[PDB]
CSV table of C-alpha atoms and ligand atoms in Angstrom, one decimal:
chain,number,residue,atom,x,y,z
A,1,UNK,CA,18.1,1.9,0.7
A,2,UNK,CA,21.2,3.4,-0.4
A,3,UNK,CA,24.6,1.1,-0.8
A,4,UNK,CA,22.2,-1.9,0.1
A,5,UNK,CA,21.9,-5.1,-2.5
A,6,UNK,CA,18.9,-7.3,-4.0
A,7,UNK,CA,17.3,-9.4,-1.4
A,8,UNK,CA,17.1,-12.9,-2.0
A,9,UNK,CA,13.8,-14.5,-2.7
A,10,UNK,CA,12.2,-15.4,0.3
A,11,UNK,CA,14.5,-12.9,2.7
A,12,UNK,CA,11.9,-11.1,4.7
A,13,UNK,CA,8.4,-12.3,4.5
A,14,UNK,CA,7.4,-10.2,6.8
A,15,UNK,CA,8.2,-7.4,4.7
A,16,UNK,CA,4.8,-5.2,3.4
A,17,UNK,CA,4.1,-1.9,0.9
A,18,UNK,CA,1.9,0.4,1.9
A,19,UNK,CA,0.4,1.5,-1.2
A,20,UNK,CA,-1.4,4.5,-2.2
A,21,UNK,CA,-4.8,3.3,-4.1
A,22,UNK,CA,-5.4,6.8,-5.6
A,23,UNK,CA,-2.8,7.9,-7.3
A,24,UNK,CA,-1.3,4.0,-7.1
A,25,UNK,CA,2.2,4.5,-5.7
A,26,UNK,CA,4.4,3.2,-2.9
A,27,UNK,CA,3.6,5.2,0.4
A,28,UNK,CA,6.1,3.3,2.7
A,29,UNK,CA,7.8,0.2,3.9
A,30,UNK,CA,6.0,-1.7,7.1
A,31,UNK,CA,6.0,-5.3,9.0
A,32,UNK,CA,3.7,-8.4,9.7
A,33,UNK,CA,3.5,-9.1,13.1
A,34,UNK,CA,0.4,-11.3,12.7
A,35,UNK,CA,-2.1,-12.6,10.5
A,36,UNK,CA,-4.0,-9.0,11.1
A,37,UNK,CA,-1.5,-6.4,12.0
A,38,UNK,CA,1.0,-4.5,10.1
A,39,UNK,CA,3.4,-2.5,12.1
A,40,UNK,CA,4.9,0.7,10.5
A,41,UNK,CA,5.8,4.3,11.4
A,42,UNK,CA,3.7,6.7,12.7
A,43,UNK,CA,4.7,9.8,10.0
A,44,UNK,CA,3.7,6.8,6.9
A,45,UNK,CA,0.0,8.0,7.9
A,46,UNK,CA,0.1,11.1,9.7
A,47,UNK,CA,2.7,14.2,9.0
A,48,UNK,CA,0.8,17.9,9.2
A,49,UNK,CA,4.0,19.4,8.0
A,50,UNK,CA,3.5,17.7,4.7
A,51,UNK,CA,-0.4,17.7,4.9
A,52,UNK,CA,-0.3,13.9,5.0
A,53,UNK,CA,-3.1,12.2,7.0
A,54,UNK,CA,-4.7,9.2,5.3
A,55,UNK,CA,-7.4,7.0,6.3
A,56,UNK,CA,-8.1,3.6,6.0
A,57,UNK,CA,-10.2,3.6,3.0
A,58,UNK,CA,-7.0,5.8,1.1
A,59,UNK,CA,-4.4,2.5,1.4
A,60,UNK,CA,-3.6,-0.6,0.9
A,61,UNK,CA,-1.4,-3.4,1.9
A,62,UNK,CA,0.9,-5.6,-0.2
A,63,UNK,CA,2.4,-8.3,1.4
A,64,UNK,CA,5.1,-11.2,0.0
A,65,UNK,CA,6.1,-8.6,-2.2
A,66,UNK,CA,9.8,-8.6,-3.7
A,67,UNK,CA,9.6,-6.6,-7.0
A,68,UNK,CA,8.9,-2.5,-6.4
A,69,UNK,CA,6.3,-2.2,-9.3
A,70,UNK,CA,5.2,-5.3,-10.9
A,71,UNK,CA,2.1,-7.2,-9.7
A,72,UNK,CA,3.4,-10.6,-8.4
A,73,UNK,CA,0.7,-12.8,-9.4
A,74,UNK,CA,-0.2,-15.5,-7.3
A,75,UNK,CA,2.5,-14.3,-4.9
A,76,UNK,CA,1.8,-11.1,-2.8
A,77,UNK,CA,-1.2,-10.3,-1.3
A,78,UNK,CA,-3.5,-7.4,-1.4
A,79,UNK,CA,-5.3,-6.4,2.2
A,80,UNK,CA,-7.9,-3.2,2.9
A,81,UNK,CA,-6.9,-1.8,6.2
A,82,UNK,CA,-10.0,-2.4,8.4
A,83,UNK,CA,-8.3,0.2,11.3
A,84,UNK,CA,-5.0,2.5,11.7
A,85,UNK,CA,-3.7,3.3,15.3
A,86,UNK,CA,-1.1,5.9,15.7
A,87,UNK,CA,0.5,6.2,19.2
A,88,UNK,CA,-1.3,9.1,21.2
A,89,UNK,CA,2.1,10.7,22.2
A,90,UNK,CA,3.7,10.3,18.7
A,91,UNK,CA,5.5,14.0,18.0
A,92,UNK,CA,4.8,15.4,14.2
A,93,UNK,CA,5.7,18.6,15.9
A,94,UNK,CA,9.6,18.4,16.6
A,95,UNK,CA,11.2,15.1,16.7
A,96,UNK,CA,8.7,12.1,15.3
A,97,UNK,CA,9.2,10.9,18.8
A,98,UNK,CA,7.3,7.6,19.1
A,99,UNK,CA,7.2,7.1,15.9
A,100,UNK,CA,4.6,3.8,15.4
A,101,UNK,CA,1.5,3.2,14.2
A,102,UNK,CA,-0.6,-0.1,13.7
A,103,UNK,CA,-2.8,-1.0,11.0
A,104,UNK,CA,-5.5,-4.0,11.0
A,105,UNK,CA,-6.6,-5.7,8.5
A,106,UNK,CA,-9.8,-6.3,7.3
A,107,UNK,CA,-9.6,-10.0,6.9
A,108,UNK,CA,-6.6,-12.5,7.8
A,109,UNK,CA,-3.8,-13.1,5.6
A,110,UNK,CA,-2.4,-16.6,4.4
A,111,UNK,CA,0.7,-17.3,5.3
A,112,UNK,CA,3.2,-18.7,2.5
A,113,UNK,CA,6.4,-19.3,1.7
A,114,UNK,CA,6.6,-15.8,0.6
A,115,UNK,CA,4.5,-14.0,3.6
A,116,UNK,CA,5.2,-15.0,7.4
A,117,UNK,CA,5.5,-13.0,10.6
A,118,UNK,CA,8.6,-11.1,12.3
A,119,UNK,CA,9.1,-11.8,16.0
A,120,UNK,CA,8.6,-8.7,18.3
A,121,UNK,CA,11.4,-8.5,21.2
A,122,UNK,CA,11.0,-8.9,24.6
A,123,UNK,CA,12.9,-7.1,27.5
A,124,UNK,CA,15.7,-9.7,27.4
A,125,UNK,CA,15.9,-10.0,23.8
A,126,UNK,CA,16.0,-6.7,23.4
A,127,UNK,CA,18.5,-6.0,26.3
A,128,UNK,CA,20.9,-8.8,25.0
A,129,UNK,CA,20.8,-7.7,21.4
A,130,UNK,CA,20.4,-3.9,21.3
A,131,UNK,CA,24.0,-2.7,21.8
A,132,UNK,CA,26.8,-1.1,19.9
A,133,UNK,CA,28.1,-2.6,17.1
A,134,UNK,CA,25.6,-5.1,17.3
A,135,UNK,CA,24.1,-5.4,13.4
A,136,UNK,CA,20.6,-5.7,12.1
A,137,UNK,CA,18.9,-5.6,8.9
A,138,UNK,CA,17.2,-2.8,6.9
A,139,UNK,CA,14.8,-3.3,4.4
A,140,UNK,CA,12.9,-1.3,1.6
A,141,UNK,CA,12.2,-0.2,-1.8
A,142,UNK,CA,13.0,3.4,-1.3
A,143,UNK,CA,15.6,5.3,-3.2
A,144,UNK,CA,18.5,4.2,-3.9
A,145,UNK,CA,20.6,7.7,-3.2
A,146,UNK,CA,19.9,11.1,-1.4
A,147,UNK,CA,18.9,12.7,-4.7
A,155,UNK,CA,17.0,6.4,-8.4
A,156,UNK,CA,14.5,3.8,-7.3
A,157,UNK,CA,15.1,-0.2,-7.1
A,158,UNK,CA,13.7,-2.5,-9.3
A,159,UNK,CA,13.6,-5.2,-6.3
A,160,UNK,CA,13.2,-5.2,-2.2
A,161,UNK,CA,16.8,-3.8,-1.1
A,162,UNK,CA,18.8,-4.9,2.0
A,163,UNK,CA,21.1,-3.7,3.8
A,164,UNK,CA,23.3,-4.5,7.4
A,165,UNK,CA,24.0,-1.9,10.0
A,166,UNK,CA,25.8,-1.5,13.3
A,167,UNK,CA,23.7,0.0,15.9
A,168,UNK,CA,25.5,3.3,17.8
A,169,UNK,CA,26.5,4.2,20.7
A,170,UNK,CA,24.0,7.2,21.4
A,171,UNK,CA,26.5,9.7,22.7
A,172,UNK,CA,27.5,9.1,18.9
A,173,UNK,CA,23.8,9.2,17.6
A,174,UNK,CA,23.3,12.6,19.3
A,175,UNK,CA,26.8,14.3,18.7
A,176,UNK,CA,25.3,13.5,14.8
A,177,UNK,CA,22.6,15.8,14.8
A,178,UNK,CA,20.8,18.7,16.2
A,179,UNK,CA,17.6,17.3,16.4
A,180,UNK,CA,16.2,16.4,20.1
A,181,UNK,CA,16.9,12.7,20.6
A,182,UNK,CA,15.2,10.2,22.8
A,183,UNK,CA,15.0,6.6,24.3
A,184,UNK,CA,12.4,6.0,22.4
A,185,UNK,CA,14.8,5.9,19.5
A,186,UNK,CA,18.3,4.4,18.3
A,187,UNK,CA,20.7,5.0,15.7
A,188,UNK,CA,22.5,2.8,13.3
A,189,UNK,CA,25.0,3.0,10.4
A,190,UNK,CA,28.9,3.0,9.9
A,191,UNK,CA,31.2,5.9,11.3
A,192,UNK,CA,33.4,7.8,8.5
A,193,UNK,CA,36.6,5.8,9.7
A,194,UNK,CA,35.0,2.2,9.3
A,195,UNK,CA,34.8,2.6,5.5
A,196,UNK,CA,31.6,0.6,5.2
A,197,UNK,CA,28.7,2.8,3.8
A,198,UNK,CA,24.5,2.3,3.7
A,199,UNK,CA,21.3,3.6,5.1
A,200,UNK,CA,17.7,4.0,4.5
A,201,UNK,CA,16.3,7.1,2.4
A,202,UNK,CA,13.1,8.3,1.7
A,203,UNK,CA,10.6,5.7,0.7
A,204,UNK,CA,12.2,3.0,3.4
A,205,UNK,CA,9.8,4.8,6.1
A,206,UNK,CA,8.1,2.5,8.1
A,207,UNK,CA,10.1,-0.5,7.2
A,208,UNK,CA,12.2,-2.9,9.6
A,209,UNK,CA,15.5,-2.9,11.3
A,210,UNK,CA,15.6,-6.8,12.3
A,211,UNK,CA,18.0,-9.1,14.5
A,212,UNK,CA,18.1,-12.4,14.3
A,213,UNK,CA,18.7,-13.7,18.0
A,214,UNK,CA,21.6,-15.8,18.6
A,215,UNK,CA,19.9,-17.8,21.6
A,216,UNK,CA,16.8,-19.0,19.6
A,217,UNK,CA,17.5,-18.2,15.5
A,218,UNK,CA,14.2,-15.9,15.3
A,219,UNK,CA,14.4,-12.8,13.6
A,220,UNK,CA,13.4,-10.2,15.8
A,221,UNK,CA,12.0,-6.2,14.7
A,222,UNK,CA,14.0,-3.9,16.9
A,223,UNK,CA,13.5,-0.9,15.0
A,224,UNK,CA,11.3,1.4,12.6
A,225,UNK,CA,12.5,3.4,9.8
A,226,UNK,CA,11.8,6.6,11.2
A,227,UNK,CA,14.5,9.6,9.8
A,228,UNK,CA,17.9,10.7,9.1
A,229,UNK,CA,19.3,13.9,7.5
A,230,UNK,CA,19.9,12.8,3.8
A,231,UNK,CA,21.0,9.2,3.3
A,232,UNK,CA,24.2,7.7,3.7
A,233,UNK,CA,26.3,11.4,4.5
A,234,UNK,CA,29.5,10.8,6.4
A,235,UNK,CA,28.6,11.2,10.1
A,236,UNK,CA,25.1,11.3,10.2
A,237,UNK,CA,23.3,8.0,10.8
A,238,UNK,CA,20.0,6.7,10.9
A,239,UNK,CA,17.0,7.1,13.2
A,240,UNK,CA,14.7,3.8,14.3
A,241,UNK,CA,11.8,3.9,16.5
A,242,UNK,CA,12.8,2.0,19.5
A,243,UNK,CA,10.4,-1.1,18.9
A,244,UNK,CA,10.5,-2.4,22.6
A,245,UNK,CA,10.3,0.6,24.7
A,246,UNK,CA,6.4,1.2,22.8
A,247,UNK,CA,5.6,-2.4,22.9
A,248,UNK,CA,3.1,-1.7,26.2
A,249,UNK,CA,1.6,0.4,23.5
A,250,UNK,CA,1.3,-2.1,20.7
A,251,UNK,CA,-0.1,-5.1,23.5
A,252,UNK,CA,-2.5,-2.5,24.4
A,253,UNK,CA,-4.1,-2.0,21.2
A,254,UNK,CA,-3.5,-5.4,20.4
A,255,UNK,CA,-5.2,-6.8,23.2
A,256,UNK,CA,-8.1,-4.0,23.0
A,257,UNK,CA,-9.0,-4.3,19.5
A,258,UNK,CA,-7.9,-7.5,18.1
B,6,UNK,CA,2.6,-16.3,16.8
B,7,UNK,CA,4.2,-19.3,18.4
B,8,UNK,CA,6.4,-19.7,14.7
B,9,UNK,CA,7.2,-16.2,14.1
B,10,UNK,CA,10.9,-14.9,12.5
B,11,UNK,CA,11.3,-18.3,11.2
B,12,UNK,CA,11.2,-18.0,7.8
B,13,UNK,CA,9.8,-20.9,5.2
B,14,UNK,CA,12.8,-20.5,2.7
B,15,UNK,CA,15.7,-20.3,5.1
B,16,UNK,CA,15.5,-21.4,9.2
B,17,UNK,CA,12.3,-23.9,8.2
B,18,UNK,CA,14.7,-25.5,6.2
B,19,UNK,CA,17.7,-25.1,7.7
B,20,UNK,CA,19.2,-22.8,4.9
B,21,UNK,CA,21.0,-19.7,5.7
B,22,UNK,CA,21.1,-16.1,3.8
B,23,UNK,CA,24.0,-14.8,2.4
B,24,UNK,CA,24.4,-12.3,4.8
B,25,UNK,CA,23.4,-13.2,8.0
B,26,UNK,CA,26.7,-14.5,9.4
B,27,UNK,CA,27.4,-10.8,9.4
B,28,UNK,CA,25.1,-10.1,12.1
B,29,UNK,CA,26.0,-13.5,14.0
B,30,UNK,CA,29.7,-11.8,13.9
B,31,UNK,CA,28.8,-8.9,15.1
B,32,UNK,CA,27.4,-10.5,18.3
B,33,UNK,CA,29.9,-11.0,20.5
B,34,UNK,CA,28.6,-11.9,24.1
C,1,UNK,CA,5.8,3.7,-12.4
C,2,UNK,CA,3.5,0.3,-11.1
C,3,UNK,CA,1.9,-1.9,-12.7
C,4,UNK,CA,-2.5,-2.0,-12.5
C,5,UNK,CA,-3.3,-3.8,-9.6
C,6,UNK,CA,-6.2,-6.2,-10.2
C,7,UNK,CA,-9.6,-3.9,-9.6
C,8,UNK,CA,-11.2,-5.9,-6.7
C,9,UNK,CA,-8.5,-4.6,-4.5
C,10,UNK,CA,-10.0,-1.3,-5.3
D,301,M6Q,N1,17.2,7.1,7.5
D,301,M6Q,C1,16.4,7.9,6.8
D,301,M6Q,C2,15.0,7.8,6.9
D,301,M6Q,C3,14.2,8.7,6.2
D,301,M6Q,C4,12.7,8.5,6.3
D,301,M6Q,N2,12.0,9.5,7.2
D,301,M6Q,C5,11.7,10.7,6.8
D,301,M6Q,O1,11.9,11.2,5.7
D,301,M6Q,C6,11.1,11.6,7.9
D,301,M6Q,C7,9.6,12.0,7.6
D,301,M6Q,C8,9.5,13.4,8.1
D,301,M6Q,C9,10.8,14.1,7.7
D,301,M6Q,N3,11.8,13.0,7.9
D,301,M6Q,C10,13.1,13.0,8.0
D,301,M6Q,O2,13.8,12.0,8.1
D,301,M6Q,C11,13.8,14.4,8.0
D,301,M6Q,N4,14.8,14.3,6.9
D,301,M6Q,C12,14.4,14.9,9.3
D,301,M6Q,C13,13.4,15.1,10.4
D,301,M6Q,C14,13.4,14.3,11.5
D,301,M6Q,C15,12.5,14.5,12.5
D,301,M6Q,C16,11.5,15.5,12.4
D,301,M6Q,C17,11.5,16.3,11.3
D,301,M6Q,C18,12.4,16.1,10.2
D,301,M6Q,C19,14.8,9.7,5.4
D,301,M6Q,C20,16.1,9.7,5.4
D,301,M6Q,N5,16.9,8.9,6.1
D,302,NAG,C1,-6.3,13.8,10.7
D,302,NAG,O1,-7.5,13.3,10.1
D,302,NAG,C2,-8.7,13.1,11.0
D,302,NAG,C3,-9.8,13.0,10.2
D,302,NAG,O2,-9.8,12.1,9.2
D,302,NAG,C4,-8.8,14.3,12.0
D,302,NAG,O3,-9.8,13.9,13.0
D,302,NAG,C5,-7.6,14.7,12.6
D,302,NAG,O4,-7.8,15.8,13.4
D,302,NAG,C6,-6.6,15.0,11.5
D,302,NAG,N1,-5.4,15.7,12.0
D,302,NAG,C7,-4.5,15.2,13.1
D,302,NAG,C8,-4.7,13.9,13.8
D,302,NAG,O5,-3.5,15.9,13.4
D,303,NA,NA1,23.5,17.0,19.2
D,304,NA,NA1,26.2,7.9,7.5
């Protein structure tokens, strides 16, 4: 997260690492929805272009997690992955259009002061709050600029775009399966996610009910933080069918 | 889950982050 | 880099 600050303790319990077990390192950011799913982006397990494709048995989960390297004893929690799902339509080849993937665990997690479950939208929430210069919420423990890493979970707010915007930005192939957020050059205000943030959550917290909702996935940008370039989110709602599918099928 | 986004350290206990009035602002319908 | 992660997780 570049031009983000510390979260506070407690901030986003939903918040999860997905962690390399062999060499140990931080693979990506990613969500609990449940006491048995994690929700993260599809290109955090599978990206030819990079030879990344990783399976089960290659990852874990750490959940309540605030600190980037330390072992939070008797805080976080460490899950094996019993399955990953990655949308069947999800596009490595050109755009990372839908960009999602699920992950279930191999055995519940407790909840805790430190660990609890995000909210996923539905059509009104989603059509109320996902609108120009509305702002949600970024989180990770990626890097800290374009080109070094935090010592805690970084946060940062961001106005969503108005896509005309989002795809003057860029000459990739955009889609409604995707937003963009972050400040314009003329409203002074800077931040973004980088690499590392992948897979993490863009949240709202709904004005009607004071839930935090996940609207969007880290998915990609073109650096971090340049002047007139924003960042990408998978579009959380629009692929929900998908998630309840899965969900409902296996779990 | 029927208590999801409500977290244990700030809406379960009716205390607010430092930051989330800037999202509230930004809200405005 | 990260500190040893206890070994049953692995
Ligand atoms: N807001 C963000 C989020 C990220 C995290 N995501 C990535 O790193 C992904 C993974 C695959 C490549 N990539 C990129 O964002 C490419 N730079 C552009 C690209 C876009 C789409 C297809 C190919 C390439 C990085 C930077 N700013
Ligand atoms: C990724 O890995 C699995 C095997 O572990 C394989 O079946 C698949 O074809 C690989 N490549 C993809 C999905 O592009
Ligand atoms: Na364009
Ligand atoms: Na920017």
């Amino acid at each position: 997260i570049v031009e983000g600050s510390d979260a506070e303790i407690g901030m986003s319990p939903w918040q999860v690492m997905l962690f390399r077990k062999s060499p140990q390192e931080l693979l990506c950011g990613a969500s609990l929805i449940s006491d048995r799913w994690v929700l993260t982006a599809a290109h955090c397990l599978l990206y030819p272009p990079w030879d990344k494709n990783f399976t089960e048995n290659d990852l874990l989960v750490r959940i309540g997690k605030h600190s980037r390297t330390r072992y939070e004893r008797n805080i976080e929690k460490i899950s094996m992955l019993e399955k990953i799902y990655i949308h069947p339509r999800y596009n490595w080849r050109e755009n990372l259009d839908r960009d999602i993937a699920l992950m279930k665990l191999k055995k519940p997690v407790a909840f805790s002061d430190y660990i609890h479950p995000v909210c996923l939208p539905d059509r009104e929430t989603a059509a109320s709050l996902l609108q120009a210069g509305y702002k949600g919420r970024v989180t990770g423990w990626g890097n800290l600029k374009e080109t070094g890493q935090p010592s805690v979970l970084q946060v940062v707010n961001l106005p969503i775009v108005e896509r005309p915007v989002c795809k003057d930005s860029t000459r990739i192939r955009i889609t409604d399966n995707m937003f963009c957020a972050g400040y314009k050059p003329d409203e002074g205000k800077r931040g973004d996610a980088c690499e590392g943030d992948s897979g993490g959550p863009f949240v709202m917290k709904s004005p009607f009910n004071n839930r935090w909702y996940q609207m969007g996935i880290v998915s990609w940008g073109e650096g971090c933080d340049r002047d007139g370039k924003y960042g990408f989110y998978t579009h959380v709602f629009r692929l929900k069918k998908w998630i309840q599918k899965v969900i409902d099928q296996f779990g | 889950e029927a208590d999801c986004g409500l977290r244990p350290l700030f809406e379960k206990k009716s205390l607010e982050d430092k930051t989330e009035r800037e999202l509230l602002e930004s809200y405005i319908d | 880099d990260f500190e040893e992660i206890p070994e049953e997780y692995l």
